[PDB]
């Protein structure tokens, strides 16, 4: 087509979605991790994670307001990834990289899994 | 902080939100324009438009599944703007610029209003 494009649009949209998350506006699901609860928007979770995409496209699960993750999932690793989903920023540190990579593999967040693999390989 | 950032994350999120819109997945509102209906996600509309932000933060309207726009609003202008919300791409043409600007002013989409004003000024 002959469209024009606003460079900062996608970033501004994500920033506003994160402001709605902060203020608990229109959040429609609770993600339960080892008895730690995280409120979010199903559409943002689906847009970021192959696991959430599969969960909320399921005809029965699409209607659930609570999702319980596998007990092996670390709440801090999940929190870091949820922040990444809403900001594009990943708080990757020596002390959390293993939990973050394991959580990203479970959530099916391929780009996160990729940078974790590379950061681990650099330290070996 | 000491975060790393994935450059394409915001764009990939918006692309996936538009794929959900295309497939009518988790859309939670119908926008009615001069008897033309558009299905969308409330959170994306709020992230893009000051009008939708005000509508869906209202304690009564946040729960509506149908929103009727002012009868002066042109369905094509709305359609072009809804596409812009989900893609960052604006199909601005000599034949639609007046309807698009009028719709962007009503929806409170300041960056769109700005490029319409500039494109109109260049043709005078």
């Amino acid at each position: 087509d002959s469209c024009i494009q606003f460079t900062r649009h996608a970033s501004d949209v994500l920033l506003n979605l994160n402001r709605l998350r902060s203020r608990d506006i229109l959040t429609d699901v609770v993600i339960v991790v080892s008895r730690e609860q995280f409120r979010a928007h199903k559409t943002v979770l689906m847009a970021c994670s192959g696991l959430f995409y599969s969960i909320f496209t399921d005809q029965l699960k699409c209607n659930l307001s609570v999702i319980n993750l596998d007990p092996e999932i670390n709440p801090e690793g999940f929190c870091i990834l949820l922040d990444f989903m809403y900001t594009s920023r990943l708080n990757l540190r020596e002390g959390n990289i293993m939990a973050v990579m394991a959580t990203a593999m479970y959530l099916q967040m391929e780009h996160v899994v990729d940078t974790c693999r590379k950061f681990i390989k650099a330290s070996e | 902080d000491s975060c790393i950032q994935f450059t394409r994350h915001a764009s990939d999120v918006l692309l996936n939100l538009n794929r959900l819109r295309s497939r009518d997945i988790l859309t939670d509102v119908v926008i009615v324009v001069s008897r033309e209906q558009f299905r969308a996600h409330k959170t994306v509309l709020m992230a893009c438009s000051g009008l939708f932000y005000s509508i869906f933060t209202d304690q009564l309207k946040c729960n509506l599944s149908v929103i009727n726009l002012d009868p002066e609003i042109n369905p094509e202008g709305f359609c072009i703007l809804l596409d812009f919300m989900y893609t960052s791409r604006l199909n601005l043409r000599e034949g639609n610029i007046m309807a698009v600007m009028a719709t962007a002013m009503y929806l409170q989409m300041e960056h769109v209003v700005d490029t319409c004003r500039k494109f109109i000024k260049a043709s005078e």
């Binding site: 494009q5 606003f6 | 490029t115």
Partner: peptide, 4 residues
């Protein structure tokens, strides 16, 4: 705004 840009030409994509």
């Amino acid at each position: 705004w840009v030409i994509p």
